[PDB]
């Protein structure tokens, strides 16, 4: 098949759109999927040089991070659980001082390979503080291209039909990072896409497992954490589980890595597991989005069964609107559709 020949190694692809290609968001997403980008689980988009979401980041020192989290990591030899201790609210100025202080700052290093080794060697020591999950945008109001606060995808059908706002999902989140702050192995809520823009600062490094080997990572994770597997049908959604790339290689799980630098977008695709860490003080904005291709993923997403506050989106509106033939069959519980991860 044509889709199977495109990005056959399911390697992370990087795109450099011109201003003209960049303008239409959902069309650019269709385009990168036409090149097989979605096979990686992650893609990088470098916006055109003369594109800017904000004039200056010099006025945000007084921005409140209301729920900073200290990240206590426990484990050894490639397998870790991250526990999140919430600290009292702090401003960006308070945060950046701590981020750059001799205590928390990025170690000296030659190339990324050495910084990555320092990450995996030291991540259970000196628990860092992540300014994660902050409600807001750093985009200026007038910015029409790739505006994370208004992408205009069909995910907008959720609020449109129901009025329901899900923070970070159909609203933007800001993430102020410092050295060694991390994000655990997860796919998106409801196996949605995510967009992630690094406004400023040091890089954010990412790992990704192709959606086509996603179940292979889950099988590994369940074997490594059998107690968690029995408690919850989707324990990785707790976003507590860290697994080093050496551990993935040891068990034959395909994965790729990429480093996002200030000014670049990352796109994660439905069912693409990703994890990563920040190099130093930075700020990222992020939200979820959807395309028609996400819809079967949404329908088949396995959700966390042990927390009451987890994200669940009714699929009803999407199946009625975009799969009217299958609606009654899906309702009778007899829709046997198999997802083909390569297909755009």
């Amino acid at each position: 098949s044509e889709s199977e020949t495109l990005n056959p190694s399911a390697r992370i692809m990087t795109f450099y759109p011109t201003m003209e290609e960049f303008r239409n968001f959902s069309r650019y997403i269709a385009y990168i999927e036409s090149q097989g980008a979605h096979r990686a689980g992650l893609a990088k988009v470098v916006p055109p040089k003369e594109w800017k979401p904000r004039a200056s980041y010099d006025d945000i020192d007084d921005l409140v991070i209301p729920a900073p989290i200290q990240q206590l990591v426990t484990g050894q030899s490639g397998l870790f659980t991250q526990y999140n201790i919430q600290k009292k609210a702090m401003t960006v100025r308070e945060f950046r001082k701590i981020a750059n202080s001799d205590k928390y700052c990025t170690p000296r290093y030659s190339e990324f390979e050495e910084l990555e080794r320092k990450y995996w060697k030291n991540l259970t020591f000196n628990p860092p503080i992540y300014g994660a999950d902050v409600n807001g945008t750093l985009y200026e109001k007038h910015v029409d291209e790739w505006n994370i606060g208004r992408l205009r995808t069909i995910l907008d059908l959720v609020e449109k039909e129901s009025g329901i706002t899900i923070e970070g999902v159909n609203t933007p989140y800001l993430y102020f990072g410092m050295w060694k702050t991390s994000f655990a192995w997860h796919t998106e809520d409801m196996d949605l896409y995510s967009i992630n823009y690094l406004h400023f600062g040091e890089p954010k490094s990412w790992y990704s497992v192709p959606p086509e080997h996603g179940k292979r990572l889950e099988r590994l994770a369940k074997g490594f954490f059998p107690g968690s597997a029995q408690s919850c049908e989707a324990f990785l959604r707790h976003k507590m589980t860290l697994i080093s790339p050496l551990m993935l290689k040891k068990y034959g799980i395909p994965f790729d890595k990429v480093t996002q630098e200030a000014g670049e977008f990352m796109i994660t695709f439905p069912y693409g597991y990703h994890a990563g860490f920040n190099h130093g003080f930075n700020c990222a904005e992020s939200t979820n989005f959807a395309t028609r291709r996400w819809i079967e993923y949404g329908k088949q997403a396995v959700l966390c069964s042990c927390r009451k506050d987890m994200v669940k989106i009714s699929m009803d509106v999407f199946v009625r609107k975009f799969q009217p033939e299958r609606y009654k069959l899906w309702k009778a519980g007899k829709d046997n559709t198999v997802i083909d991860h390569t297909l755009p």
Binding site: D133, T165, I166, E167, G168, V169, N288, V311
Partner: peptide, 4 residues
């Protein structure tokens, strides 16, 4: 609903 929920929260991310």
């Amino acid at each position: 609903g929920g929260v991310k």
